[PDB]
Design a protein around this ligand. Sequence first.
Ligand SMILES: CC1(C)CC(NC(=O)C(=O)Nc2ccc(Br)cc2)CC(C)(C)N1
Ligand SMILES: *[C@@H]1O[C@H](CO)[C@@H](O)[C@H](O)[C@H]1NC(C)=O
Ligand SMILES: *[C@@H]1O[C@H](CO)[C@@H](O)[C@H](O)[C@H]1NC(C)=O
Ligand SMILES: *[C@@H]1O[C@H](CO)[C@@H](O)[C@H](O)[C@H]1NC(C)=O
Ligand SMILES: *[C@@H]1O[C@H](CO)[C@@H](O)[C@H](O)[C@H]1NC(C)=O
Ligand SMILES: *[C@@H]1O[C@H](CO)[C@@H](O)[C@H](O)[C@H]1NC(C)=O
Ligand SMILES: *[C@@H]1O[C@H](CO)[C@@H](O)[C@H](O)[C@H]1NC(C)=O
Ligand SMILES: *[C@@H]1O[C@H](CO)[C@@H](O)[C@H](O)[C@H]1NC(C)=O
Ligand SMILES: *[C@@H]1O[C@H](CO)[C@@H](O)[C@H](O)[C@H]1NC(C)=O
Ligand SMILES: *[C@@H]1O[C@H](CO)[C@@H](O)[C@H](O)[C@H]1NC(C)=O
Ligand SMILES: *[C@@H]1O[C@H](CO)[C@@H](O)[C@H](O)[C@H]1NC(C)=O
Ligand SMILES: *[C@@H]1O[C@H](CO)[C@@H](O)[C@H](O)[C@H]1NC(C)=O
Length: 339
Amino acid sequence: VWKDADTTLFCASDAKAHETEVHNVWATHACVPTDPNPQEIHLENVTENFNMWKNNMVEQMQEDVISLWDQSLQPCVKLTGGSVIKQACPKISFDPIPIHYCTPAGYVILKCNDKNFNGTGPCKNVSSVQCTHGIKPVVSTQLLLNGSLAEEEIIIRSENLTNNAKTIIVHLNKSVEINCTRPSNGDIRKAYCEINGTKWNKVLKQVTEKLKEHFNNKTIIFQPPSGGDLEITMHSFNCRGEFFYCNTTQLFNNTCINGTITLPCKIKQIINMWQGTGQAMYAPPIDGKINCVSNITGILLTRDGGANNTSNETFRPGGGNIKDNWRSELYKYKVVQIE
Ligand SMILES: CC1(C)CC(NC(=O)C(=O)Nc2ccc(Br)cc2)CC(C)(C)N1
Ligand SMILES: *[C@@H]1O[C@H](CO)[C@@H](O)[C@H](O)[C@H]1NC(C)=O
Ligand SMILES: *[C@@H]1O[C@H](CO)[C@@H](O)[C@H](O)[C@H]1NC(C)=O
Ligand SMILES: *[C@@H]1O[C@H](CO)[C@@H](O)[C@H](O)[C@H]1NC(C)=O
Ligand SMILES: *[C@@H]1O[C@H](CO)[C@@H](O)[C@H](O)[C@H]1NC(C)=O
Ligand SMILES: *[C@@H]1O[C@H](CO)[C@@H](O)[C@H](O)[C@H]1NC(C)=O
Ligand SMILES: *[C@@H]1O[C@H](CO)[C@@H](O)[C@H](O)[C@H]1NC(C)=O
Ligand SMILES: *[C@@H]1O[C@H](CO)[C@@H](O)[C@H](O)[C@H]1NC(C)=O
Ligand SMILES: *[C@@H]1O[C@H](CO)[C@@H](O)[C@H](O)[C@H]1NC(C)=O
Ligand SMILES: *[C@@H]1O[C@H](CO)[C@@H](O)[C@H](O)[C@H]1NC(C)=O
Ligand SMILES: *[C@@H]1O[C@H](CO)[C@@H](O)[C@H](O)[C@H]1NC(C)=O
Ligand SMILES: *[C@@H]1O[C@H](CO)[C@@H](O)[C@H](O)[C@H]1NC(C)=O
């Protein structure tokens, strides 16, 4: 017998003690080795309720990633609360590694194995584990990168679809690669992302059809962000320590519903912190080819309000709350206390 409960989790990873890469360093001192032979118990015809939108596991992963960035990516100048903090800001080795989240004695993690599970409600196929799967703490907006894929159909996730103020997480069942490069050798900050147009438009059409099922077959329209900070209006992410801001206008235009899609990007030194603090400024980009090839595995969407009297629903890429990023991976888990 058990019950829903919150407790302090610990982490496990396969980090290398000899790596200077910041994630490896953090996990080496903050986590333990992973279990080579993990045990999993499938509960016989047990029904459990989940709520990915109210899961303390999310808050804890957030806290880990905040501390990791706080120790690994200190900017030259921090602007928060009115005070100005200056300090050294050397370039680092940066490449996210999988982090496992595990429960201590007296506790266990319940895992929903239901196909097409949306993250909330009852789960029929439930198993118990000590640790989650390996989750890379990838920080980004608009597009979710290097995450897990839905096993069956594309899944739409939201705490409340009817509430347009609540973020929508689209969980893809097929990866679309995004190839971002800052070429070696008139602007060290100019960059670009290449994406297979055929693959993207096909997936996006599948997402459209999926959104129809949730919005009474209303017409689904995609549009670029209306306004807001650059971190939100553009696809923001960190590649090799450098902050990339990419213009995704070409991705979200309800027209191509063929060739290569080249998104214009730029590396920014001055960033609005996702931690919520304030503003941070980093040193200029390192020289040479700066390249990151990522899997697009999900999308963060915000729905336009004031469309109730029309046959259209408008969706725009969003994000900014990194907790949603962790939710996209932790949705199927919950902690319970055993006796
Ligand atoms: C809640 C709300 C509206 C979200 C905002 N988000 C961000 O500034 C953000 O996500 N920035 C960011 C930075 C680097 C990378 Br790489 C990706 C994204 C920041 C705060 C202060 C928390 N307000
Ligand atoms: C329940 O989930 C487990 C783990 O994914 C899977 O092996 C099993 O086939 C599922 N059971 C059914 C009947 O769907
Ligand atoms: C998830 O599935 C449950 C099944 O009862 C349902 O109540 C809930 O509305 C679903 N959530 C979404 C966003 O589809
Ligand atoms: C992805 O999900 C959609 C439904 O959302 C489905 O039609 C399609 O077959 C899936 N693709 C793959 C490769 O499973
Ligand atoms: C979902 O959002 C709608 C629109 O804001 C609201 O009227 C409704 O109460 C919400 N549903 C729940 C279960 O809170
Ligand atoms: C990229 O996506 C493919 C599946 O489309 C997967 O096999 C591979 O592991 C992914 N790479 C990651 C997760 O970094
Ligand atoms: C990514 O794009 C760059 C520049 O076009 C290219 O050199 C590289 O081969 C690409 N990588 C992959 C895996 O497609
Ligand atoms: C969408 O249209 C199809 C085809 O007529 C219908 O079967 C289905 O019930 C509709 N779905 C919604 C959510 O309105
Ligand atoms: C993206 O590029 C388009 C032109 O292709 C431009 O109109 C738009 O302002 C850009 N978006 C942002 C957020 O800068
Ligand atoms: C969508 O693409 C078409 C291409 O002809 C363009 O004219 C239109 O302005 C685009 N809408 C946007 C970028 O919102
Ligand atoms: C995208 O993939 C398809 C095969 O799925 C291929 O035919 C097409 O050439 C690719 N497009 C690009 C831009 O490479
Ligand atoms: C995604 O994973 C690939 C393979 O490990 C990596 O090269 C790339 O830098 C990752 N993308 C991001 C945004 O971290």
